[PDB]
């Protein structure tokens, strides 16, 4: 029967939308993202609440009084934090800070526009009810790299699990230290390094807790074939009007499953627990990682 079902879906596989006849009042698309009222790890500091129909910069919004908040950890100026006077810095091009290259270019088609009054960049993706840097160390675009290491979900017999006529994926997920929500491994790009090193380094630090000889070589084989699936704006709750997270997503897919099987998952650094988790559309993950998983299943023609 399994073969009959498999042959049947391999052989059976003006655009008009008639859903208005069923619902009656369509409430558009997914609208626009609004971050939560309480800023994480801030000690009860509350943002300026705004409706989702008011976030975009095309809309006027004269009633706007955001709160300026910067975290004490960021205000202590660590090596990875930009100076408090964000003038003297060129955005939208590759900029050299202490002789080390940092990206600073946003994936928004319009680009980043610079405010005249304080020299602080303004977020194009839309308001968030909060100015200043907050928990983010760099003014403007904080480039994050996410590592989606995937394998096909297989039952013991060796057959790949199939749901809704598509093959089922499986990805490595970590439990975050700060908010205890499951997420894709990844992190902010360090100075003088690129997305390749950052993606790989964060995946070893978080999901493998490293820092294995031929096994190490096996892991290298896994990371020899990676595809940049998306470069999007994160729906991260720490985002403000002057500092926002944008992610480049790198997918490492293991077609045979040999290289994926050599990974001894054990949470380290900013991860509590790490495990293999099935990819589907009902996942409750941190920030906009569901969109990233949608992009990896879209690229691999997998279930979602």
Partner 1 sequence: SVAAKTLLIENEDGKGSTRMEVQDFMKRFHMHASEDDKTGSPSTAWGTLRFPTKEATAPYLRLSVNDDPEDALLFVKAMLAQKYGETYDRPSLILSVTGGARNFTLPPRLETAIAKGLRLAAQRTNAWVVTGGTNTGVMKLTGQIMEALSKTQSHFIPPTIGIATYGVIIGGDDMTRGEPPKIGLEYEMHKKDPPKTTPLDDNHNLFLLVDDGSTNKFGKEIKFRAAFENAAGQAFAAPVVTIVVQGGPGTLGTALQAVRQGTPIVVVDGSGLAADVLAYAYNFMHNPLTRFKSYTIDDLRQKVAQTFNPKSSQQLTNLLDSALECVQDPNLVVVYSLQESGIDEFDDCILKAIFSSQGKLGNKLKQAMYFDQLDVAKRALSEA
Ligand X SMILES: Nc1ncnc2c1ncn2[C@@H]1O[C@H](COP(=O)(O)OP(=O)(O)OC[C@H]2O[C@@H](O)[C@H](O)[C@@H]2O)[C@@H](O)[C@H]1O
Binding residues for Mg(2+): 186, 202, 205-206, 269-270
Does 62 contact partner 1 by CB under 8 A?
Answer: no
Under the criterion CB under 8 A, does residue 55 sit at the interface with a copy of itself? no
Instruction: Based on the shown chain and the rule CB under 5 A, indicate whether residue 187 belongs to the binding site for Mg ion.
Output: yes
Q: If binding is defined by CB under 8 A, does position 155 make contact with a copy of itself?
A: no
Structure tokens at 101: 């290259």
**Strand, helix or coil for residue 215:** helix
Q: Note the Cα 137 to chain centre separation in Å.
A: 17
Q: How far is the CB of 78 from a copy of itself (least distance, A)?
A: 22
Q: Is 150 in the site for ligand X (CB under 6 A)?
A: no
Closest by CA to 42, choosing from 130, 127, 135, is 135
Q: Give burial (CB, 10 Å; 0-12/13-18/19+) of 201.
A: middle
- CB–CB of 127/54 below 8 Å? yes
- If binding is defined by CB under 6 A, does position 86 make contact with ligand X? no
As a whole number of angstroms, the distance between CA 19 and CA 23 comes to 6
DSSP state of 189: P
Measure the CA–CA gap between 58 and 113, rounded to whole angstroms. Answer: 13
Residue 159 touches partner 1, criterion: CB under 8 A: yes
For residue 5, give the 3-state DSSP assignment: helix
Q: Does 164 engage in binding with partner 1 (CB under 8 A)? A: yes
Which 242-281 positions form the footprint of partner 1 (CB under 8 A)? Answer: 256, 275, 277-278, 280-281
Contact between 234 and ligand X per CB under 6 A: yes
- Contact set with partner 1 (CB under 8 A): 1-2, 5, 155, 157, 159, 161-165, 214, 218, 256, 275, 277-278, 280-282, 284
Binding stretches for a copy of itself (CB under 8 A):
1-8, 10-23, 152, 157-160, 164-165, 167, 195-197, 199-201, 203-204, 216, 219-220, 223-228, 250, 252, 255-256
């Amino acid at each position: 029967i399994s073969f009959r079902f498999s042959l049947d879906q391999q052989a059976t596989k003006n655009r008009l939308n008639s859903a208005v006849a069923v619902h009656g009042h369509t409430a558009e698309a997914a609208e626009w993202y609004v971050p939560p009222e309480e800023y994480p790890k801030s000690g009860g500091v509350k943002r300026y609440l705004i409706d989702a129909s008011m976030v975009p910069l095309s809309i006027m919004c004269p009633s706007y009084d955001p709160v300026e908040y910067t975290h004490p950890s960021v205000a202590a100026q660590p090596v990875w934090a930009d100076p408090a006077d964000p003038r003297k810095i060129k955005f939208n091009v590759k900029d050299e800070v202490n002789g080390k290259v940092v990206d600073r270019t946003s994936c928004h088609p319009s680009g980043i526009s610079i405010d005249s009054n304080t020299g602080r960049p303004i977020n194009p993706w839309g308001r968030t009810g909060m100015t200043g840097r907050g928990l983010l160390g760099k003014w403007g675009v904080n480039q994050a790299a996410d590592t989606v290491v995937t394998r096909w979900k297989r039952s013991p017999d060796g057959s790949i699990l199939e749901r809704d006529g598509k093959k089922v994926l499986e990805f490595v997920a970590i439990q975050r230290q700060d908010n205890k929500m499951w997420a894709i491994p990844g992190g902010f790009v360090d100075n003088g390094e690129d997305v390749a090193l950052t993606s790989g380094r964060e995946f070893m630090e978080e999901a493998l807790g490293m820092g294995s000889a031929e096994s190490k070589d096996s892991l290298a084989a896994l990371f020899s074939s990676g595809t940049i699936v998306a470069r999007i704006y994160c729906e991260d709750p720490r985002n403000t009007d002057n500092a926002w997270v944008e992610t480049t997503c790198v997918n490492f897919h293991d077609e045979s499953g040999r290289h994926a099987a050599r990974l001894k998952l054990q949470g380290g650094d900013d991860a509590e627990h790490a495990r293999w988790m099935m990819v589907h559309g009902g996942l409750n993950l941190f920030a906009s990682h569901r969109t990233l998983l949608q992009h990896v299943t879209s690229a691999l023609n997998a279930y979602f």
